[PDB]
Amino acid sequence: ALTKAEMSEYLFDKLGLSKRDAKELVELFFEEIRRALENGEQVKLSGFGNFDLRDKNQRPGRNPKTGEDIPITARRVVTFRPGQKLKSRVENASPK
């Protein structure tokens, strides 16, 4: 799996950034996205996808193991809608 460490190393190798800055940058990129999202704003990254917020009303759920009917509480969740560009690049992938 790709990690922040791998991302930093990549920024270092490709852009010649100091390992300090590469590290901070990766961290910031993700943080900025979180900031927008927690702030109710949609994030649209052209060529990748959109991170949208959906408000879900309470609905019936259950403790899977037992069967005890428990409600899934109302909540605001973050979803990702991959764009056509990303989707095409991935359609013919083969899990490594």
Partner: protein, 94 residues
């Protein structure tokens, strides 16, 4: 917030890192994520989420406008799963 807006916001707060560098980095980071998924490998950023690949079996779909059938090949689609920190920070409701 678009890609460019994300870049501007980062540059702004990181006065010590050159704006051009920030732009290049964001672009590079995204391309890296993209190619990773294109290679069939997953992405896992603790506190943000993970991107995995989901399989879709071949099927006889329809062109929704005309109704004609279309033979669809099996394939892979990206799937994002928000991590704990992101879920919690996003959820405004209890």
């Amino acid at each position: 917030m678009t890609k460019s807006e994300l870049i501007e916001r980062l540059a702004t707060q990181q006065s010590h890192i050159p704006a051009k560098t920030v732009e290049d980095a964001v672009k590079e980071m995204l391309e890296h994520m993209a190619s990773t998924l294109a290679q069939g490998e997953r992405i896992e950023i603790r506190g943000f989420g993970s991107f995995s690949l989901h399989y879709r079996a071949p099927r006889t779909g329809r062109n929704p406008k005309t109704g004609d059938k279309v033979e669809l090949e099996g394939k892979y689609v990206p799937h994002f799963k928000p991590g704990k920190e992101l879920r919690d920070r996003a959820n405004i409701y209890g």
